[PDB]
Structures are given as structure tokens and as C-alpha cells.
């Protein structure tokens, strides 16, 4: 509530790494990389459409999870919840490290292990508290931090004056196999949608504001990306093998003049902590939506949510079991698996806008039937282009979820179609 | 129909590689390997229980797929069908290669590429025809071939006289047994043969649950009374079999001389399981077809199985793997389908709980535990299976889902629907 603070969240929850994204992508060239932002933005825009439409037909508590529930039943709803709930706070631990690693990286306040681990846990509860007492208040905070974090990116254009960069300086491979290696970066840079969908229930004035923020935030972060990754791969820190090594930041203050004292990392650190609260917000939301139904422990619904702390207690437990102990083999990899979890809800939501809203089409049916087919292929490629290892455990999680469900809802479950009786 | 020909199928569809299994497992030792057959047989027996019970409460067309349908709805039923249907015939192409590769390997009739590829396609339709006109006739064939194939294994015990053979890669006893499961967990992908065989099978609700436990307990004895009767003492030490595929090695340290009649029947015990799987292929296809899920053609007039659509595909995917250059990508697929088979296994367990939570006894905790083992069983099997493979199993679910929401858009029955 209302619209303008939400449209910033939908975009903010995407750009928790918009400032650093460029260099990591410049490795696989940056000239024929823009020749790849299309495939990404097109597919990603198709997803923003689906969620925008699905939310206009049903402003839910809600999902995602909600849409999944209706579409496929209780099982896949319950499942959609867990996966997404985990991806929310498990994805948060990597955001504090990098978040704080932007404040104490340029001063440099403090750096050592047991020193940074405490200020992260500290700032975590700093946002866990803002959520448990101010849905409007937390949306204010993010709205503030995301605008600050945008100052640089929006300030970068300001184009003068690009200089023919490496164009296609990526590893020797056909233009097709070259763009494929660029998607491994761009496809995952739009895991910010559905922020309004689950934000519904709150958000207020939904059915309109949500679908608007869903397309707004995306079209905002879509411009930022292609009007930032271009305004740097030409001409500030070229050639490719100049940024390909060092993390961007102070490199934007030489080839057009800013001096420094770099005030860049001072706000690009808030644009990572501002997205902290937003995700914990969603965490408790999907948890409540589920809790309010026969699926997922009741405590997560108790006026915002009181069990918002169970997320905080866990985020801290999984903060210590990754920083202090040396390995870390498990804490380290788990943080990347949760990212794939986020793709399962994305999937079903599409299947939902079809299976459910096959009536409210227009019938501009083929047009809708196609947009959902793109968003489908989008999510599919994202998965494929993601090192085997990671995916393997996403699967094993489904494996567990399933068993975990049939062992907790044994009799509470409503079977279609049931047995006979004798 | 009736029982005795089916109990042999449930076991036959497990031992399509029971004769070769030993050596591949001897690599990771064979002494502390028996100290691993327990974990396997226990978990695998737990699965045979679930299916035996689930089928006694509902003799279905059927699944698996069927149980999955009731349990979770139409979507997961439809999905359970595809995955299992594919795993049936995609798993068949590797059975003809190895099957024929047991006849023309010891004579040796013929060996070359475009020569073996033709006799496989030939023997494929040889079983595709036996199925499209004789469910009893095909069960006769397998019943015959599986008994023949058992002659060696059952004849191996005959124990005299074992000789003291953990020679696996340096690793704690726990990490040593884990590497043994990568062989044993997957050696029991033969269950649920009777469950899907229901509808046919006749006299079900009893015969099926009996064959489900019978076949397993039969192939469970064969394994542990064969892998032991060889890792002691015929071809030891470990690094004697660890290199060469067993077969003629069982005719020196106790047995008769040349002319090995072993590979002559152990080739039929691989072709006899050919028809059985195509049988199930058309069965799960029909069961699904007979419901709103899966193309209608797979259910027709003739009182048996569109059983040819499977044959047409098995041939297309036979050529696109032997004659053609590449040629590896379409070879990985043959191993992915194996994991597909684990998804039905999963839901079936979830079913015997979610559905049959009444007919328990209530010996509830006892049932509630058996299903928990079979659960963990299927879970480990998946984990202990090189990332790559699993990744594409997931991508298949990805596709299946989209494939469904794009074909049953309006036919789908939504719980709970929208509004106005």
C-alpha cells in the first residue's frame, strides 16, 4: 500500500545485485551480450505478464502458492509454499554478507570473520523487527533504499562517450553458443517478479495495483539493466579484460570524472539491505497464506505476522553454521540451491493462468496462450543452464517434501478420488 | 493370469542383468558388499510391501498411475503415467543391445554395427507382436525364459568351497557401503510389475500382492545367493573379475569345460524381460487413456492394448543411437529414463498412506514405518546417482507440466475453481 511503494519493491527484489552484475557478465563479452538481453527481457517480460494477469483474476493472500493450490490442489500448493518460503530466507543470508560487504569494504570499518558475522546477524533482526511491526514502514524503508541505490544506475546515462568494445570477446564459440553462456547470468537476474503477487493481502487496493507493479517493476529494472550494462561496456572501463577481473564500483569515477571518496558503494549497500526486509516480508506472507489453510504449521498466522521471528531465528542459525565453522561445504552450496527452488512456483503459476483463467482470456486466447508458452520456456532454460549439481538437490528436495507431506497430512488430506471403505 | 506366470514376471523384470551384476559390484569389493545387501533388501522389501498392500486395497487398470491419480489428482496421475511409460520402452532399447550381445557374443554369429542393429529391431517387433496378440502367451514366454535364465543362478549353490576373499577404495565402512548401493539400490527396479499388470493378471487383489512379495523375495535370494557364491571362491581375488565380465569364469573353479551353455540362456533372460516391459508400457498407457489423461489411441477394441506405437518409437530411437554419428547425447537419455521409474515408486508410498490410512489394522505404526523405509529407499537411490542424470529428470517434470497445461487447458477440472 499503495502502488508507488510496491512498484519499487517488485523492482528492488530484483536488483539486489544490479550494481555488480555487469562485470560478472562482461567475462563472456559485453558487446554481443546486449544481443542477448533481448531473449532475456522477452522471456522475462512474458513472466511479468502471466503474474500480472493471474493476480488480476485473483488477488490472493497469497501466492503463487494460492494459484498453485487452486490449479493443482493442496499437495502442490503445500509444496509450492515450502520451496518458495525457503528460497526467501535462505536467499537472505547471502544478501547480508554482500550487503555489509559493501559498507565495511569501503572505509573499511571492520572485516574479520567473527566481526562481520555479528553485524550481519545484527542487521538481520534489524529488518526482522521492521517487518513484525510496520508493513507500511518496511515498504517505506525499501522505497527509500531502492531509490538511493538507483541514483548511480539512473545517473549512468550519461552516455558520452562509448568506444567500440570487444565485439564478442567471449570464449570462441558460435554466436548461438555465445549467447547461451550469457543467459546463465541474465535469466537469473530477473528473480524479482511475483513480489507483488505474494505481497497481496497486504498491498491493498489489489487486483489492479499488483498487476501494475508486476509489469512496472520489471520494465523499470529491464531498462536499468540494458541502460547500465551498455553504458559501461562502452566506454568507461573497457576493454573487456579490464572489468573481467576487478569488481566494478570505483571504476565509474575515472572515465567521465567523479573523483572519490566513492559515494557509490555507500548507497549500493542500502540497495542490498533494502531488499532484505522485502524478502522476509514475503517469507512470512507465503507462510501465513499457507498456514491460514490446512497446509503448513499454524504458528505462521497469528495486523502482520507474529511468527515472523521463526524466520529470524533460522536465518541466524544458518548464519553461524556457514561463517564460524570452516566448512561450510554444505552451508555454501545450499545457498545456491534455494535459487532454483524459486523457479518451481514460477512454473506452476504459468500452468495456472492457463488451467484456471482459460475463460477470462478475451478471447485473445492465442496471444495469452503464447505469452505463457514463452514464460514456460524461459523457466525451463534457466533450469537447464545451471550446473547439474545444483539441480540434483532441488530434485532431492521435492523428494523430501513429498514424503514430508504424506507423513504429516496422512488423514487431514482430502483424497480425489477416495477408496471404497470395507 | 494366473499367479505362477506372474510371480516370474515380477522377478524377471528385475533380473534383466542378474548374471552380469556381480562383477560390476565386485569392483567396490565383494566381502563387505554383502554387508550392504541388507540395507538394500530391507529398503527394497519395504517397497514390495507398499505395492503389495496398495494393490490389495485397489486392483487397478492400472498404476501406480492409478494410485497416484486417486492420491493427488489428475495432474500427477497424468505425469506419473508419462514418466513410467517412457521408462518402459526407453529402457527396452538397452535390453536388446545387451540381449543380442549375449547371443552374437558367444559364437559369434555377427557383431558389426548395421548388423546387430537390425537383429535388435527384428527381435523387438518379435515381442511387440507377441504382446498385441497374447497376454497369456507372452507371460508363457517370459515364464519360460526366466526359468531358463535362473538355471545358472539357481544352479550356483553349489557353494564348495569359498575362500577368504573390503578391498574397495580406501574409505570408512560407511562410505564404502554407500558406493555399493549405487549398484544394489537400482537392481530392484523390478517391482510394481504386477500392480500395473493388474486389469490383466486376473484373480487380482490377492495374486498381485502375492507376486509382488514373491518375485522380490525370489530375486532377493538369487542376488545374495549368487554374489556370495562367486565373491568366494570361483573367480577371486577381486581384481580378477573386476576387469572381465563374468560368464565363462564359472566353469573353471568347480565346473565343466568349454562350450558355455550359460550365455545361451542368460540371453533369453534378457529377451524374456523385453516383452514384459512392452506389456506394461501399453498397460499404463491404456489405464491413462481410459481416463481423461493421455491420447485415446492407447486404448482400443482388440482385447489387448496401440501397442505398436511403442514399437514404432523403439525402432526410431534404435536407429538414432547405433548407425548415426554423434552419437552420445541420445545415449545419455537411456540412463535418465531409469530415474523416471523412481517417481512412481515415490507417490505409491505417499498413496498407501494418504489413501489407505483406514485399512491399516490399525497396525498403523508398523505400516507407517514400512512406508517410511521405502520412502528413504527411493530418496537415497536418487541422491546416489551422478548429478547430470538427475538434472534432466527434473527438466522432464518441467516439460511434462507445461505439456499438460497446454493440452488439458479446459478439459482440466480445477479444485477450487475461480469465480465469475
Amino acid at each position: 500500500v499503495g502502488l508507488i511503494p510496491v512498484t519499487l519493491m517488485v523492482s528492488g527484489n530484483i536488483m539486489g545485485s544490479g550494481v555488480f552484475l555487469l562485470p560478472a557478465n562482461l567475462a563472456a563479452t559485453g558487446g554481443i551480450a546486449i544481443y542477448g538481453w533481448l531473449v532475456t527481457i522477452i522471456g522475462a517480460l512474458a513472466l511479468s505478464m502471466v503474474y500480472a494477469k493471474m493476480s488480476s483474476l485473483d488477488p490472493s493472500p497469497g501466492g503463487s502458492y494460492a494459484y498453485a493450490r487452486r490449479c493443482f490442489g493442496p499437495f502442490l500448493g503445500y509444496q509450492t509454499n515450502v520451496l518458495y518460503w525457503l528460497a526467501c530466507w535462505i536467499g537472505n543470508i547471502a544478501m547480508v554478507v554482500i550487503g555489509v560487504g559493501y559498507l565495511s569494504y569501503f572505509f573499511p570499518i571492520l572485516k574479520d570473520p567473527l566481526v562481520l558475522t555479528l553485524t550481519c546477524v545484527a542487521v538481520l533482526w534489524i529488518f526482522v523487527l521492521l517487518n513484525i511491526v510496520g508493513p507500511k514502514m518496511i515498504t517505506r524503508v525499501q522505497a527509500v533504499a531502492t531509490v538511493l541505490a538507483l541514483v548511480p544506475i539512473v545517473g549512468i546515462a550519461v552516455f558520452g562517450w562509448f568506444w567500440f568494445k570487444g565485439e564478442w570477446n567471449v570464449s570462441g564459440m558460435n554466436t548461438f553458443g555465445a549467447i547461451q553462456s550469457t543467459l546463465n547470468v541474465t535469466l537469473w537476474s530477473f528473480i524479482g517478479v511475483e513480489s507483488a503477487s505474494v505481497a497481496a493481502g497486504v498491498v491493498k487496493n489489489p487486483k489492479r495495483n499488483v498487476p501494475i507493479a508486476t509489469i512496472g517493476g520489471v520494465l523499470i529494472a529491464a531498462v536499468c539493466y540494458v541502460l547500465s550494462t551498455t553504458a559501461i561496456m562502452g566506454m568507461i572501463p573497457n576493454a573487456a579484460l579490464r572489468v573481467s577481473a576487478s569488481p566494478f564500483g570505483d571504476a565509474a569515477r575515472m572515465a567521465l570524472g567523479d573523483t572519490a571518496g566513492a559515494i557509490v558503494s555507500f548507497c549500493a549497500a542500502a540497495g542490498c539491505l533494502g531488499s532484505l526486509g522485502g524478502w522476509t516480508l514475503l517469507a512470512g506472507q507465503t507462510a501465513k497464506a499457507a498456514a491460514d489453510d490446512g497446509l503448513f504449521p499454524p504458528i505462521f498466522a497469528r495486523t502482520p505476522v507474529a511468527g515472523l521471528l521463526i524466520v529470524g531465528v533460522l536465518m541466524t542459525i544458518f548464519q553461524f553454521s556457514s561463517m564460524s565453522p570452516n566448512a561450510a561445504k554444505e552451508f555454501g552450496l545450499v545457498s545456491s540451491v534455494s535459487v532454483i527452488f524459486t523457479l518451481v512456483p514460477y512454473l506452476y503459476t504459468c500452468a495456472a493462468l492457463l488451467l484456471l483463467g482459460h475463460g477470462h482470456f478475451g478471447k485473445a486466447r492465442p496471444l495469452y496462450l503464447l505469452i505463457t508458452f514463452v514464460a514456460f520456456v524461459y523457466c525451463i532454460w534457466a533450469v537447464i543452464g545451471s550446473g547439474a549439481k545444483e539441480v540434483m538437490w532441488s530434485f532431492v528436495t521435492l523428494m523430501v517434501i513429498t514424503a514430508l507431506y504424506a507423513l504429516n497430512y496422512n488423514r487431514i488430506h482430502k483424497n480425489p478420488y477416495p477408496l471404497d471403505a470395507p | 493370469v494366473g499367479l505362477i506366470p506372474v510371480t516370474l514376471m515380477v522377478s524377471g523384470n528385475i533380473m534383466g542383468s542378474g548374471v552380469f551384476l556381480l562383477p560390476a559390484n565386485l569392483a567396490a569389493t565383494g566381502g563387505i558388499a554383502i554387508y550392504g545387501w541388507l540395507v538394500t533388501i530391507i529398503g527394497a522389501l519395504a517397497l514390495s510391501m507398499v505395492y503389495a498392500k496398495m494393490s490389495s486395497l485397489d486392483p487397478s487398470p492400472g498404476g501406480s498411475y492409478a494410485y497416484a491419480r486417486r492420491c493427488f489428482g489428475p495432474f500427477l496421475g497424468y505425469q506419473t503415467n508419462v514418466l513410467y511409460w517412457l521408462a518402459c520402452w526407453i529402457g527396452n532399447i538397452a535390453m536388446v543391445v545387451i540381449g543380442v550381445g549375449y547371443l552374437s557374443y558367444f559364437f559369434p554369429i555377427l557383431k558389426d554395427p548395421l548388423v546387430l542393429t537390425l537383429t535388435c529391431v527384428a527381435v523387438l517387433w518379435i515381442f511387440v507382436l507377441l504382446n498385441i496378440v497374447g497376454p497369456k502367451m507372452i507371460t508363457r514366454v517370459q515364464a519360460v525364459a526366466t526359468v531358463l535364465a535362473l538355471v545358472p543362478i539357481v544352479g550356483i549353490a553349489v557353494f564348495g568351497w569359498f575362500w577368504f576373499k573390503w578391498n574397495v577404495s580406501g574409505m570408512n565402512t560407511f562410505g564404502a557401503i554407500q558406493s555399493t548401493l549405487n549398484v544394489t539400490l537400482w537392481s530392484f527396479i523390478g517391482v510394481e510389475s504386477a500392480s500395473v499388470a493388474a486389469g490383466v493378471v486376473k484373480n487380482p487383489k490377492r495374486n498381485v500382492p502375492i507376486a509382488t512379495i514373491g518375485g522380490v523375495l525370489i530375486a532377493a535370494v538369487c542376488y545374495v545367493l549368487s554374489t556370495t557364491a562367486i565373491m568366494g571362491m570361483i573367480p577371486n581375488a577381486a581384481l580378477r573379475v573386476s576387469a572381465s565380465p563374468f560368464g565363462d569364469a564359472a566353469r573353471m573353479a568347480l565346473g565343466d569345460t568349454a562350450g558355455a551353455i550359460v550365455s545361451f540362456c542368460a540371453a533369453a533372460g534378457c529377451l524374456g524381460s523385453l516383452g514384459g516391459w512392452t506389456l506394461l508400457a501399453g498397460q499404463t498407457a491404456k489405464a491413462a487413456a481410459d481416463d481423461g489423461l493421455f491420447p485415446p489411441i492407447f486404448a482400443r477394441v482388440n482385447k489387448a492394448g496401440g501397442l505398436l506405437i511403442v514399437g514404432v518409437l523403439m525402432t526410431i530411437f534404435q536407429f538414432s543411437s547405433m548407425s548415426p554419428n554423434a552419437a552420445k547425447e541420445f545415449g545419455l537419455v537411456s540412463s535418465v529414463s531409469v530415474i523416471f521409474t523412481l517417481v512412481p515408486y515415490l507417490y505409491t508410498c505417499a498413496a498407501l498412506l494418504l489413501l489407505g490410512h483406514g485399512h491399516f489394522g490399525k497396525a498403523r505404526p508398523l505400516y507407517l514405518l514400512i512406508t517410511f523405509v521405502a520412502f528413504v529407499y527411493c530418496i537415497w537411490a536418487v541422491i546416489g546417482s551422478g548429478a547430470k542424470e538427475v538434472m534432466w529428470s527434473f527438466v522432464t517434470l518441467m516439460v511434462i507440466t507445461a505439456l499438460y497445461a497446454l493440452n488439458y487447458n479446459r478439459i482440466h477440472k480445477n479444485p477450487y475453481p475461480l469465480d465469475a
Partner: antibody, heavy 120, light 107 residues
């Protein structure tokens, strides 16, 4: 609001068959099932079967045959025949009913009821 | 073939009195449903998922139970409450209803 209302008639002669209708409105006819229950003279109600306007249908075992549930998507209603009626099988007002979902398991909307006498 | 056999068959109560009708069950089920049929007319949804109140149903009503024993109750009786209440299940096949409990007002 769901309406789901039916027809008042009619009397029947033993042996002959009847065809009762239930025209639904207020919701999309093809999103849910359509159920039928048979309530003897101020007595217990007996489920009969459902029918999916989408396609197929399930029928109560006891009343094997003796009735065929049909439907037309167009008219947004659903027919229902009683095959081999007999003097005693006389309604027992017949009700059409739609669940609130679907799947499982309680009827949220009932037809007004159709009284059926089968005498000569 | 899952019998409902609910009792009492017929009962009467004065306005303000606590009414309690039960519903046995052949074998254990999860969830039971109650409908309120007045004078032969089309039944009305009242108690779904064992303890859920329908749209209009007044707070005065309430349901409970599990396994084989379920029961519908009302704190204070009312003239309106007079009717026949039907317990019903869908936990197995086919779905079935009870004999009905006939509640009459006392005057």
C-alpha cells in the same frame, strides 16, 4: 449465487423411463461436477452419481445402470434418465447438487427437487 | 458401503435448551458434513469439514468429533432450529448420508 434448478414433472408408468433436467446458472457449468441424490419419502438421501460437463462421470454402485447421467454444454443444463423404473423406485424427490469444490466433498448447492411418481 | 446410523431418530427441546445429536459411523472417517432439511424441501449446507459453519448458520450451532463419533450441537434451541439434520460423508465410496435426526420444538 448458484441457482441449479430443475423440473416439477412427472408421473411414470412402470417399465417406461423418465428424463429429468437440472439447469444451472450463476457459475460456469463446465467448471464443476453435477451430482444426483435420491431421497425416499422423508427418509435418508442416497447418492446416485456425478457428471462432468467436461466429459465423463461416476455412478453409485448400488444403482448399477437403471439410469444414465448426460449433459449438454450449450444449454448449461444436464439431463438424467431412469431406465427400468418400478412401482417402488418412485421418488423420493430427486435432487441435483453441486459441491463447493470438487474435489471433496460436501454439497453447497442443491436443486429445488423433482418429485417422480411411477404408477399405472 | 459406509453406514452413518445417526441418533436420536426423533427428539424435542424447549427454546433455550441445549440440543445434541450424534452420528456413529460404520468405520473411521475424516470429516463429516451436516445439512438442514426443513419439511421435505431441498437440503441446506450447514456443517462442512466436521466443524466449519456455513454462510448464514448462527453461532448457536457447532460440530465436532473424529473417527467414528461425530455430533452436532446447539447451545440454546430456537424455533427455527426445528428441522431434520443430515450427517454425510465423502471419505470413501460411495458418499453416504445418515438416517437423519428429527428435531422438534417443545411447547
Amino acid at each position: 449465487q448458484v441457482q441449479l434448478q430443475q423440473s416439477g414433472p412427472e408421473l411414470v408408468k412402470p417399465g417406461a423411463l423418465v428424463k429429468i433436467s437440472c439447469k444451472a446458472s450463476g457459475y460456469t457449468f463446465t467448471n464443476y461436477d453435477i451430482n444426483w441424490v435420491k431421497q425416499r419419502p422423508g427418509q435418508g438421501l442416497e447418492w446416485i452419481g456425478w457428471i462432468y460437463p467436461g466429459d465423463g462421470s461416476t455412478m453409485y454402485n448400488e444403482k448399477f445402470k437403471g439410469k444414465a447421467t448426460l449433459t449438454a454444454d450449450k444449454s448449461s443444463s444436464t439431463a438424467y434418465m431412469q431406465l427400468s423404473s418400478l412401482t417402488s423406485e418412485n421418488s423420493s424427490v430427486y435432487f441435483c447438487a453441486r459441491l463447493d469444490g470438487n474435489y471433496g466433498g460436501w454439497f453447497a448447492y442443491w436443486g429445488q427437487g423433482t418429485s417422480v411418481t411411477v404408477s399405472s | 458401503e459406509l453406514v452413518m446410523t445417526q441418533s436420536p431418530a426423533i427428539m424435542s427441546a424447549s427454546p433455550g435448551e441445549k440440543v445434541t445429536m450424534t452420528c456413529s459411523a460404520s468405520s473411521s472417517v475424516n470429516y463429516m458434513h451436516w445439512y438442514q432439511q426443513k419439511s421435505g424441501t431441498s437440503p441446506k449446507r450447514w456443517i462442512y469439514d466436521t466443524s466449519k459453519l456455513a454462510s448464514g448458520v448462527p453461532a448457536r450451532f457447532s460440530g465436532s468429533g473424529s473417527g467414528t463419533s461425530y455430533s452436532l450441537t446447539i447451545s440454546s434451541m430456537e424455533a427455527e432450529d426445528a428441522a431434520t439434520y443430515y450427517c454425510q460423508q465423502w471419505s470413501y465410496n460411495p458418499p453416504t448420508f445418515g438416517g437423519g435426526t428429527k428435531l422438534e420444538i417443545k411447547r
